[PDB]
Amino acid sequence: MAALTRNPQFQKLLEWHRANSANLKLRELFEADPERFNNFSLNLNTNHGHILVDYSKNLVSKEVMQMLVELAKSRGVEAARDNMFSGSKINYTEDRAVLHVALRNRSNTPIKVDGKDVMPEVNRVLDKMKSFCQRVRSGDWKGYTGKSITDIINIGIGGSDLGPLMVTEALKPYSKGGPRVWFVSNIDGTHIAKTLASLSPETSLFIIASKTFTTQETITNAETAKEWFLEAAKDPSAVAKHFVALSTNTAKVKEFGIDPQNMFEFWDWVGGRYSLWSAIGLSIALHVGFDHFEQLLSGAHWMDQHFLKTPLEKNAPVLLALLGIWYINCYGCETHALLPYDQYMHRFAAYFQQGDMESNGKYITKSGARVDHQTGPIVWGEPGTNGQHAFYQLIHQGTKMIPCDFLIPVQTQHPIRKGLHHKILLANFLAQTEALMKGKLPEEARKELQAAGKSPEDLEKLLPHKVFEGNRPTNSIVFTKLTPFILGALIAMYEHKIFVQGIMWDINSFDQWGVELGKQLAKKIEPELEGSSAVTSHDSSTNGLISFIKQQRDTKL
Amino acid sequence: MAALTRNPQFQKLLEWHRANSANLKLRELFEADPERFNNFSLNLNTNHGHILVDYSKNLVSKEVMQMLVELAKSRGVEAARDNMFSGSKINYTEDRAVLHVALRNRSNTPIKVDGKDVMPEVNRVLDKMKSFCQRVRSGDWKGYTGKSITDIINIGIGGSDLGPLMVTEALKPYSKGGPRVWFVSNIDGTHIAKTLASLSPETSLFIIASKTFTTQETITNAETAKEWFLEAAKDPSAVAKHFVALSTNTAKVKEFGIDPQNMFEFWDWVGGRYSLWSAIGLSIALHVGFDHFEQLLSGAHWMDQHFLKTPLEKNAPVLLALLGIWYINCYGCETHALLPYDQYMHRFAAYFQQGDMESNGKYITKSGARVDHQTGPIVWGEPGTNGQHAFYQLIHQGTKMIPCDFLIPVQTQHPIRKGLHHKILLANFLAQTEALMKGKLPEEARKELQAAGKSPEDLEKLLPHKVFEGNRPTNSIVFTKLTPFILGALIAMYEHKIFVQGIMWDINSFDQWGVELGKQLAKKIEPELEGSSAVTSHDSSTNGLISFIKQQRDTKL
Numbered sequence A, B: 001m002a003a004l005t006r007n008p009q010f011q012k013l014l015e016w017h018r019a020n021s022a023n024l025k026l027r028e029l030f031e032a033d034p035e036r037f038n039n040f041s042l043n044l045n046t047n048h049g050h051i052l053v054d055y056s057k058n059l060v061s062k063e064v065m066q067m068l069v070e071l072a073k074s075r076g077v078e079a080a081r082d083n084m085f086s087g088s089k090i091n092y093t094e095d096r097a098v099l100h101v102a103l104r105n106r107s108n109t110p111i112k113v114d115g116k117d118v119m120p121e122v123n124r125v126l127d128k129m130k131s132f133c134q135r136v137r138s139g140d141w142k143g144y145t146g147k148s149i150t151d152i153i154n155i156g157i158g159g160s161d162l163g164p165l166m167v168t169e170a171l172k173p174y175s176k177g178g179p180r181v182w183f184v185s186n187i188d189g190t191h192i193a194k195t196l197a198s199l200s201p202e203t204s205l206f207i208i209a210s211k212t213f214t215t216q217e218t219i220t221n222a223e224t225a226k227e228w229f230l231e232a233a234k235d236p237s238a239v240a241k242h243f244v245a246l247s248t249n250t251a252k253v254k255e256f257g258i259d260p261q262n263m264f265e266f267w268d269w270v271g272g273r274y275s276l277w278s279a280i281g282l283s284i285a286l287h288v289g290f291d292h293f294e295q296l297l298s299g300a301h302w303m304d305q306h307f308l309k310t311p312l313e314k315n316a317p318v319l320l321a322l323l324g325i326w327y328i329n330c331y332g333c334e335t336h337a338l339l340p341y342d343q344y345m346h347r348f349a350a351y352f353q354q355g356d357m358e359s360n361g362k363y364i365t366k367s368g369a370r371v372d373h374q375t376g377p378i379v380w381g382e383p384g385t386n387g388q389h390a391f392y393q394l395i396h397q398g399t400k401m402i403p404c405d406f407l408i409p410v411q412t413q414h415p416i417r418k419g420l421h422h423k424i425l426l427a428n429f430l431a432q433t434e435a436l437m438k439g440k441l442p443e444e445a446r447k448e449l450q451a452a453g454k455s456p457e458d459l460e461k462l463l464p465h466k467v468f469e470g471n472r473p474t475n476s477i478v479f480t481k482l483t484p485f486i487l488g489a490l491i492a493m494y495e496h497k498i499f500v501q502g503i504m505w506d507i508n509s510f511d512q513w514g515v516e517l518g519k520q521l522a523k524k525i526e527p528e529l530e531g532s533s534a535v536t537s538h539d540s541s542t543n544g545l546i547s548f549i550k551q552q553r554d555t556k557l
Helices: A008-023 A026-032 A062-074 A077-085 A119-137 A162-170 A189-196 A216-233 A236-241 A250-256 A279-288 A290-309 A316-330 A348-360 A392-397 A416-438 A442-451 A456-466 A484-505 A513-528 A540-552 B008-023 B026-032 B062-074 B077-086 B119-137 B162-170 B189-196 B216-233 B236-241 B250-256 B279-288 B290-309 B316-330 B348-360 B392-397 B417-438 B442-451 B456-466 B484-505 B513-529 B540-552
Strands: A041-045 A050-054 A151-155 A180-184 A204-209 A243-246 A335-340 A378-380 A404-411 A474-481 B041-045 B050-054 B151-155 B180-184 B204-209 B243-247 B263-265 B335-340 B378-380 B404-411 B474-481
Touching: A008 A062, A008 A316, A026 A416, A041 A316, A041 B540, A050 A316, A050 A484, A050 B540, A062 A077, A062 A316, A062 A484, A077 A290, A077 A484, A119 A279, A119 A290, A151 A216, A151 A279, A162 A180, A162 A279, A162 A348, A162 A484, A180 A189, A180 A279, A189 A216, A189 B417, A204 A216, A204 A279, A216 A236, A216 A243, A216 B417, A243 A250, A243 A279, A279 A290, A290 A316, A290 A484, A316 A484, A335 A348, A348 A378, A348 A484, A348 B392, A378 B378, A392 A416, A392 B348, A392 B513, A404 A416, A404 B540, A416 A474, A416 B189, A416 B216, A416 B513, A416 B540, A442 A456, A456 B513, A474 A484, A474 B540, A513 A540, A513 B392, A513 B417, A513 B456, A540 B041, A540 B050, A540 B404, A540 B417, A540 B474, B008 B062, B008 B316, B026 B417, B041 B316, B050 B316, B050 B484, B062 B077, B062 B316, B062 B484, B077 B290, B077 B484, B119 B263, B119 B279, B119 B290, B151 B216, B151 B279, B162 B180, B162 B279, B162 B348, B162 B484, B180 B189, B180 B279, B189 B216, B204 B216, B204 B279, B216 B236, B216 B243, B216 B250, B243 B250, B243 B279, B250 B263, B263 B279, B279 B290, B290 B316, B290 B484, B316 B484, B335 B348, B348 B378, B348 B484, B392 B417, B404 B417, B417 B474, B442 B456, B474 B484, B513 B540
Parallel strands: A151 A180, A151 A204, A204 A243, A335 A378, A335 A404, A404 A474, B151 B180, B151 B204, B204 B243, B243 B263, B335 B378, B335 B404, B404 B474
Antiparallel strands: A041 A050, A050 A474, B041 B050, B050 B474
């Protein structure tokens, strides 16, 4: 088997689930214990706002939580965590440290890799970012015609895109005095084309985000941007005024036409999907200002310290991880829904699709043996209340068990109409988890149908359709306000949840070998598309699709 | 038990799956039969472009497809379809017809409800839409200060939002010379606030989209918009120049204060999640022009006729539906991924989250029996290559089986860099399904590591991590170009897929009782948020969360 399934604490948990889980009813758990909320929630005071992690509406008892905590311990979570924080090379397939925690280490306590403190270099790059932010935001940095920059365009894929996009979207209110920010990520020419259509080459600055500076899609997009730029500027020396790099490849950066002074470095122990805290976050710092960027880092730092210092049984990311293990490995739930009741957080779910799924969508353990159990879930979601009018029908009355995290700030950035909109938003946030837990009994629905004037025959037919079975578990994560600090804390919290789950499954949360095959096959297909000659080098489907492409590309519609 | 599980053709299929499915290996199926693509694909000629539905990379044989088609016949799919098209009241819990097909019935062949042809009224409203679009787009329609309209704002949620938003996004290249379109949907005040911040009351036209005209989010947003407008206009008569309604509820439209001549009517047999084809599509027609809206309808009509007239074994929506049944009810796959390799289609998956999940996320059958089998899947996805660089790690090397539909136009709207971007996009579209099908055997990975010059120890350490198990099934849907017509055909294709699955599960695809409970509970919580006193009326979590809200809402951050 595998490390997890051979673990006696896991076997005990699974056996208990088999024997007892059918008896777990949320309605009954709350009725039996008025202290349930108090005992199954964490009210975290960060000194810059509170984060309430309410996990009480979960299918767990004290005994279940105890078994889960014991499993975390016996899977080595405490030791593994300390190893991450100390710069041990826990990314074992690539033999790398995992040090996104160093990027936001505001305390500056030395963290060594290969015997050398990484903090001086972390802080040097941060200082460089700060100086660049001053130059651009002040208007001192001039474009090729001598005008201040009004637009910043981040070009990057995956981890070089999702974080900066999600964070600038979430922190939009903090962008007064900052340039507009745009994100180009898709190789699909539509993306860069529609972006450039609304820009002036005189006042636009491009941030090319790529560690190697050879990333195909990113560099292609970058080269398209440069071509567009040079059509107007007609001077290759002007490129340095309008293009900067988040990279370590000095030579390639120089060759592109970027001044190497404007290459913002990061390190191999910064995973792409954990990189917004590094140089990769430059577009964030430009948009909302360096002070706000430091606040974002500080919030993550607070959560890192919480994760590091807190006993497992009251440790927010650990508990979220454990509830996930319960639903994934005991209930067999494929998915995890992230439902922020916040329009600014509209890209939060998409972000954690990479953060969670690329980390933990794995099947080989540390020993090299295949898992014989489930690993990472499919993450998905849309903001409330919109989701209520799209897919909550299935959550309430479908055939899937779907653990959901509901998230909301207490204070809105836009308290319009004396708080009326936010009052309604909050009411829905609370009602939905209540509804998912309680459901609606036949006796409740029957009375409603009778009052509605339904005939005995119509009532009988309609009754089962109107019943809500309930017993659908949720987490409610509520925070004072979505500030840079609080957002930082929330992202870090999920980062550490993902870490804990990865350790428990005995997988590597920090590599991504599963992207390789698609890349290899794409490189082979690219040159085959040119010209009218038949392609026969693949399976008949790939061949047939290519044939269709060649036949249909000249058709006039 | 339920109709599906009692069905002998279903039990035959499931028994076959149990005995034979482990012997289905895609790589070997393709190697053994050069005709596989030919035998398991449909090349549809619409006379306005081709749609290739390639289902050959699925875990199916001729025998499987035969059994599925036989099951469709046994479940009365053709009769149920004919009943939909004829105006039979197949929405049995609400006693309503289901006639989104009437909305786009370009043939104008009578379709009767209660003995009365619906087509005259369908066409009357379409004519009203056409006339209104001409007046606004030409600049003839003037605001309260005598200026042409520059901005249209759709206010609506769910079915009154997702379609118009998805379609205007997808058809963006067709919007030249149209007014800017905005979508306000969330009750979250952020949504309307940041929209109004960018607008002038003098040049903005609001479109209040609501079937019932009583949805709290929509009416509240609409009232906020009206208040903002009237603060500037200071004249109630001016509202008629700036507010129109799309609804079935004349009385509530009048009550809100909208001119009866400013109401674009639809009917109870138009489901919200099937409503973009109706008056609800007004924002589409305004943005891209009524001619392009007619083309969208015409494409849907083509697909309607395809669905109606084609033998099941060669019927695109039927085959897509059957493959889904295979994966859901035999393999037990919770999810269905929609992955359009098209940035314009970035909201396609979100649209079908409602279309699919609100339709088929059900648990009660026509007989009144609770299902003892799975119904609708969780739909999710991001456009390629964005999703590709976020979560494909899990699709390739996780522990979940995830049916994926890959979609792409052969011709891009933006053939920049002499087609370079689209070449890369196409190569990745093709390579990913190739990779998912083929995988990479241990011996193949071994040879690669050998060639890289890895030591025996390093090779052995890395080997298992480099293996791709493959055998991951996909559909590839490729079409000449994403025109209004082709988009209409594609949306209708999935609508009918959803219909077929619903009939086979014996559920009602056209009601949505599951949204009621959340609405009820939110109304109760609303007034409880007012004031500083503790709430004790609910379970301890709901109470505790309310306590947190009250304690945290006055903290200065």
